[PDB]
Design a protein around this ligand. Structure first.
Ligand SMILES: Nc1nc2c(ncn2[C@@H]2O[C@H](COP(=O)(O)OP(=O)(O)O)[C@@H](O)[C@H]2O)c(=O)[nH]1
Ligand SMILES: Nc1nc2c(ncn2[C@@H]2O[C@H](COP(=O)(O)OP(=O)(O)O)[C@@H](O)[C@H]2O)c(=O)[nH]1
Ligand SMILES: [Mg+2]
Ligand SMILES: [Mg+2]
Lengths: 311, 151
């Protein structure tokens, strides 16, 4: 198995992938067409589904039978990262289907998902995709751990994509197997926390990636925590998580970007996130909903034929 | 399927087509006679209905049975553009009939339609043709999306 396999789906996933092409063979991209394929993608894996050239209900029956074929192109790995938009038609279908397959592999993985906010279609898709991940968490009895990134009004997709790529790199660093005290089994039991803590409920959880003790301590109701420290003198057993582990980073590890990084999983935060999306959409729809069309310009007097022709 | 097929109907459609002849094979023109056919049209498709050499009620029964024949000359495309005057007799009949057929293809398309303003005949035709498009939108359960340009 490789150390980590990175999986990207849909346009948003393709776009984020462009920022991670230096990871090469470890990167696997999937989409239903080539609208988002650019030259830099030659450096990574790209697979497009057949017969599929925004509506998830339409895309699902077309792509479902192809999933096994997609999975054969994804090597066995010690950890996976999955990335896509919750709000489109392709990423939000391919992403969760592949995620279900990773759960069947008994894999350790996290996802980076975008809350798209443009339209009621985006918002509806966001809701259905979050519900999808919840259903998968239940059906596979496994936490589905996601770093949720909302497209906040006024912020460029470029900016958001940059932030996501930088977080993905921290996870790639986390799982690089080069830290003192930190095992592949330690990582597995961090993210698959219900395996050994059977009294906990598998569900959609959030991943919070923080670079200070203060920010990490402020994650509410933390369930499972992993901390990396460059200066082992700064290690402090803070917070109240059920599961906690620490790794010591190496100063000659060129990928070490920060002095300490905390990866905190909780789940009592997704609620609000969803509420904000529902409330925001409601307000927007209310302004556009409150409509009142005018009366028909044609009366029962006009002679209209079967094609609606009035001659 | 081609990327886009452009369809023009009636005199106004023929006239607009002359400005788009560089698009060649993608352009398909239809009329009931040749009053608006000029040399540059050789570069595109032109089809004239049979037995039809301003009154829409008169033109409709003549052209309706020929529509299937017209549609066979229009390739399957990923998108269509339709263009005609709302206010004459030929464009405002051929245009919407072809539009109905495109709806049956489950096609994606938009139209460019002209609001003719010369006479009460033009204005009456404009009204009846807009109503036609509304009836089609309802019957085919599809938005009929038009860029409206008043003279
Ligand atoms: N953060 C971010 N959001 C995007 C990007 N592209 C599109 N979006 C938003 O995500 C939604 C889904 O787009 P996309 O991922 O391309 O859809 P898909 O290809 O069907 O999976 C769009 O409607 C936008 O609101 C991107 O590059 N970054
Ligand atoms: N914008 C524009 N309007 C036109 C043109 N030719 C005619 N019209 C107006 O549109 C009406 C219909 O003309 P036309 O399209 O030739 O009728 P049709 O051949 O029966 O479809 C005329 O009565 C004019 O008011 C044109 O080239 N451009
Ligand atoms: Mg797409
Ligand atoms: Mg004419």
């Amino acid at each position: 198995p490789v150390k980590v396999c990175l999986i990207f789906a849909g346009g948003t996933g393709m776009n984020v992938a462009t920022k991670l092409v230096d990871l090469g063979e470890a990167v696997h991209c999937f989409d239903t067409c080539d609208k988002n394929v650019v030259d830099v993608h030659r450096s990574v894996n790209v697979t497009l589904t057949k017969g599929t050239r925004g509506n998830r209900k339409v895309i699902l029956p077309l792509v479902r039978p192809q999933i096994p074929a997609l999975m054969d192109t994804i090597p066995e790995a010690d950890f996976y990262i999955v990335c896509y938009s919750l709000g489109g038609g392709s990423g939000s279908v391919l992403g969760p289907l592949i995620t279900g397959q990773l759960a069947d592999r008994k894999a350790s993985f996290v996802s980076f998902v975008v809350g798209a906010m443009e339209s009621t279609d985006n918002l509806g898709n966001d809701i259905d995709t979050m519900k999808t991940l919840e259903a998968i968490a239940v059906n596979k009895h496994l936490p589905i751990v996601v770093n949720y990134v909302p497209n906040t009004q006024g912020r460029s997709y470029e900016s958001i994509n940059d932030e996501i790529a930088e977080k993905i790199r921290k996870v790639v660093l986390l799982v690089n197997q080069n830290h003192g005290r930190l095992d592949v089994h330690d990582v597995a039991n961090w993210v698959r926390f219900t395996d050994k803590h059977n009294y906990l409920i598998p569900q959609v959880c959030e991943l919070h990636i923080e670079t200070t003790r203060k920010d990490a301590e402020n994650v509410p109701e933390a369930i499972s925590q992993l901390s990396l420290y460059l200066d082992p003198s700064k290690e402090v057993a803070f917070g109240t998580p059920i599961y906690r582990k620490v790794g010591i980073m190496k100063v000659d590890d060129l990928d070490v970007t920060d002095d300490q990084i905390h990866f905190v999983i909780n789940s009592v935060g997704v609620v609000e996130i969803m509420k904000t999306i529902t409330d925001s959409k409601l307000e927007m729809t209310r302004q556009q909903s409150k409509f009142t069309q005018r009366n028909p310009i044609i009366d029962a007097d006009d002679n209209v034929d079967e094609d609606g022709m009035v001659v």
